Amino acid sequence: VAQGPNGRALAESMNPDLLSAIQQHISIERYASVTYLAMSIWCAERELAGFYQFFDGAAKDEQSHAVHFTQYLIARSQSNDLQTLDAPRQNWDSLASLMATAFQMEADTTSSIQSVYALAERNSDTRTTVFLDPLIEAQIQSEDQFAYLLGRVKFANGDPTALLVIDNELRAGQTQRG
Amino acid sequence: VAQGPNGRALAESMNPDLLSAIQQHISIERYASVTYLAMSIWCAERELAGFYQFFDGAAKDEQSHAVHFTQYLIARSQSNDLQTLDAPRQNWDSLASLMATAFQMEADTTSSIQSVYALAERNSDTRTTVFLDPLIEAQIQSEDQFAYLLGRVKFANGDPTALLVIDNELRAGQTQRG
Amino acid sequence: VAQGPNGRALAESMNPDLLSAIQQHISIERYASVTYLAMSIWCAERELAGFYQFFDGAAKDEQSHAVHFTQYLIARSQSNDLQTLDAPRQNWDSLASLMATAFQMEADTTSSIQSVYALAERNSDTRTTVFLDPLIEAQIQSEDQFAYLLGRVKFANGDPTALLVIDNELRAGQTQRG
Amino acid sequence: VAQGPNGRALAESMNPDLLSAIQQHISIERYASVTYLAMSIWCAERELAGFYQFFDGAAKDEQSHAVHFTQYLIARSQSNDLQTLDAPRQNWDSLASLMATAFQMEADTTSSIQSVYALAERNSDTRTTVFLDPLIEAQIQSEDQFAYLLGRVKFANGDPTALLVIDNELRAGQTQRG
Numbered sequence: 164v165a166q167g168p169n170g171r172a173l174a175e176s177m178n179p180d181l182l183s184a185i186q187q188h189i190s191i192e193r194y195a196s197v198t199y200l201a202m203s204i205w206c207a208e209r210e211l212a213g214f215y216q217f218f219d220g221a222a223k224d225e226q227s228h229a230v231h232f233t234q235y236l237i238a239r240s241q242s243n244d245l246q247t248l249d250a251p252r253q254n255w256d257s258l259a260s261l262m263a264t265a266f267q268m269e270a271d272t273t274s275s276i277q278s279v280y281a282l283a284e285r286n287s288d289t290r291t292t293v294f295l296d297p298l299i300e301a302q303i304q305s306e307d308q309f310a311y312l313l314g315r316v317k318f319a320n321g322d323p324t325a326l327l328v329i330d331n332e333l334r335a336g337q338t339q340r341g
Numbered sequence: 342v343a344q345g346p347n348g349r350a351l352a353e354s355m356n357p358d359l360l361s362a363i364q365q366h367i368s369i370e371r372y373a374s375v376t377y378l379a380m381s382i383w384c385a386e387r388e389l390a391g392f393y394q395f396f397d398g399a400a401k402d403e404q405s406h407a408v409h410f411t412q413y414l415i416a417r418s419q420s421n422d423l424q425t426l427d428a429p430r431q432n433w434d435s436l437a438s439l440m441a442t443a444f445q446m447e448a449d450t451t452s453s454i455q456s457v458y459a460l461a462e463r464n465s466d467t468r469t470t471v472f473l474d475p476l477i478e479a480q481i482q483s484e485d486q487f488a489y490l491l492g493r494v495k496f497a498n499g500d501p502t503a504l505l506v507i508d509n510e511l512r513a514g515q516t517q518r519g
Numbered sequence: 520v521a522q523g524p525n526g527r528a529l530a531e532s533m534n535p536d537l538l539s540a541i542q543q544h545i546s547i548e549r550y551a552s553v554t555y556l557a558m559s560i561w562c563a564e565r566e567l568a569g570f571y572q573f574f575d576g577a578a579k580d581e582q583s584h585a586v587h588f589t590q591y592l593i594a595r596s597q598s599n600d601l602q603t604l605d606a607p608r609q610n611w612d613s614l615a616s617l618m619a620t621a622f623q624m625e626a627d628t629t630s631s632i633q634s635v636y637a638l639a640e641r642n643s644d645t646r647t648t649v650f651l652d653p654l655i656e657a658q659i660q661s662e663d664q665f666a667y668l669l670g671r672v673k674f675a676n677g678d679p680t681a682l683l684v685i686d687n688e689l690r691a692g693q694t695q696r697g
Numbered sequence: 698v699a700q701g702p703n704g705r706a707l708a709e710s711m712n713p714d715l716l717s718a719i720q721q722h723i724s725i726e727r728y729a730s731v732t733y734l735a736m737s738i739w740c741a742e743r744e745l746a747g748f749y750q751f752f753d754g755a756a757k758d759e760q761s762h763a764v765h766f767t768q769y770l771i772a773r774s775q776s777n778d779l780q781t782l783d784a785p786r787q788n789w790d791s792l793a794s795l796m797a798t799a800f801q802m803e804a805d806t807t808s809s810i811q812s813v814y815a816l817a818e819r820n821s822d823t824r825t826t827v828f829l830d831p832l833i834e835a836q837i838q839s840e841d842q843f844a845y846l847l848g849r850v851k852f853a854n855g856d857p858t859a860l861l862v863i864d865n866e867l868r869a870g871q872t873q874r875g
């Protein structure tokens with residue numbers, strides 16, 4: 164029985180390029196987390212308490228997703244490499260513009276998973292593609308969700324009354340099409 | 342004891358014109374079903390989740406109504422004839438215009454039942470007029486309901502805030518005057 | 520942030536050939552639905568109440584599967600295109616022959632999903648292959664199930680007593696090997 | 698305030714031909730009752746306990762239907778006229794032949810109601826047509842039911858095993874398509 168790079172018993176070696184891609188994706192999701200935290204604060208600063216609560220929970224969820232990836236590296240007996248975290252964006256001209264960044268950030272998160280996925284397929288790492296499958300499924304749901312929130316906010320067309328109504332929807336947990 | 346056209350024991354023969362009218366009405370209700378499905382999708386595409394949920398349920402209900410008619414033909418020992426289903430309308434310029442088509446589609450469904458009803462009266466088919474009576478009663482309730490939804494959406498006069506409020510009413514199941 | 524063909528925010532563009540394949544598959548499943556409805560009626564016409572109940576539920580389930588696909592197109596910000604629905608087959612010489620068509624229809628449904636699946640792999644659309652994975656798993660279960668029902672009916676070898684026994688099994692919900 | 702023929706206050710006079718038709722129909726349903734009793738006995742004599750139980754209950758139900766008609770005459774302040782009851786048929790060569798008579802007897806019961814119904818329409822007696830409407834609805838259900846039982850027994854094609862299976866279905870209360 165051989166030892167993996169993190170010292171645990173090694174079930175199967177992992178391509179170093181694939182390892183680097185996973186460690187980088189963990190950074191993407193940690194960055195999405197602090198980005199949602201920044202968005203939470205921006206919303207709280209404008210008394211959009213429902214949006215604040217939503218993004219506060221989104222920040223904690225994204226962090227969980229990131230930690231889920233660190234557990235997989237442990238499971239594969241690979242080293243983690245927790246990297247420097249950039250500062251998030253913190254300024255937006257409007258809720259609509261913030262929601263656009265939020266959607267793009269979710270779509271970008273999926274793109275990063277897809278990049279890892281293609282690398283695992285190139286290396287025939289079926290453990291990794293199986294590991295990623297439900298995470299892609301969750302990304303589809305999050306993309307559907309953020310397109311719903313973005314589109315609903317754009318439908319409001321900057322009217323505060325409509326934004327207050329949507330804000331209260333979010334505070335109540337009404338956050339997707341259902 | 343004689344056998345009906347579908348092979349079951351025959352309680353009383355049915356005029357072939359009346360049979361054709363019922364088979365055609367089953368198509369009307371199947372078409373209303375796929376029409377409400379199309380309307381559900383149009384609403385979902387614009388993040389009108391309450392309207393989406395309402396029309397998704399309306400599609401399943403209309404299909405039930407159609408199957409209820411197939412059961413009556415079985416009960417009368419008559420053959421069913423499930424026909425080609427046209428594609429539904431799928432494009433509207435506005436929610437108000439969609440709701441207008443929905444109301445017209447409900448009124449048209451009633452007209453088709455009324456046409457069957459008059460044919461049964463001409464043929465003195467009291468089983469059929471009795472069978473249709475509660476379905477006409479349901480149509481009155483659906484017409485009242487769709488006139489309420491249409492009129493409420495027209496009252497909104499295209500304002501997104503008002504449409505979001507109505508959307509949330511539908512998501513909560515507040516779908517008629519009560 | 521770009522807009523998809525159905526107007527929603529677009530997480531990633533979809534190949535038009537893949538879109539057409541999904542819209543066509545939705546038709547396959549809608550057609551399987553009305554086919555099971557026709558089979559329900561054929562069974563009811565011959566007092567095979569258990570088979571009637573089974574196929575009535577199978578029709579509603581297939582329709583749900585179809586709507587599940589329309590939701591995915593919405594989630595991907597792609598247009599739906601609900602198409603003309605052919606009339607189903609409605610005549611069989613025997614229950615055994617009906618069950619043969621039912622099994623073939625289920626196997627054909629899987630073939631259509633597999634065709635979509637290969638197209639998504641060619642286009643590296645991992646959202647779609649992930650989306651299809653549990654639907655293929657369900658198809659395996661349905662194929663196993665319909666092979667069980669078909670084989671059990673063939674074992675009866677046209678004996679009415681055996682068919683009545685199986686009919687009662689279906690009415691009780693005993694519809695697979697367990 | 699005028700008095701009706703049975704001495705009660707009279708809401709509206711009833712055509713004597715319509716009165717006679719109702720009194721005659723009450724005889725039809727009393728005769729259907731004793732006929733189902735005879736069928737119950739025939740089945741019990743051949744150890745077909747499920748069919749015996751079914752027809753014993755059918756006899757009591759038909760009697761209830763008859764009494765429901767006497768209550769309507771009372772409600773209309775019309776005299777009842779309980780008539781001589783013929784002896785029922787009591788001999789059949791087979792269960793299939795008995796079930797054929799049972800179905801015909803149910804269809805004949807509906808024909809008699811339809812005859813009353815047409816007479817009330819000729820006389821514009823809307824109380825009577827309204828009174829008869831749910832009874833016609835019940836007749837549709839009974840015709841559907843007896844066509845199911847007859848067809849299932851004919852499917853058995855005289856095989857005792859199949860008849861024992863159906864017999865047990867009836868004893869369990871499985872008496873229609875459901």
Ligand SMILES: [Cl-]
Pocket residue numbers: 257258259260316320321
């Ligand atoms: Cl805004």
Ligand SMILES: [Cl-]
Pocket residue numbers: 435436437438494498499
């Ligand atoms: Cl509008």
Ligand SMILES: [Cl-]
Pocket residue numbers: 613614615616672676677
């Ligand atoms: Cl067979």
Ligand SMILES: [Cl-]
Pocket residue numbers: 791792793794850854855
């Ligand atoms: Cl027999």
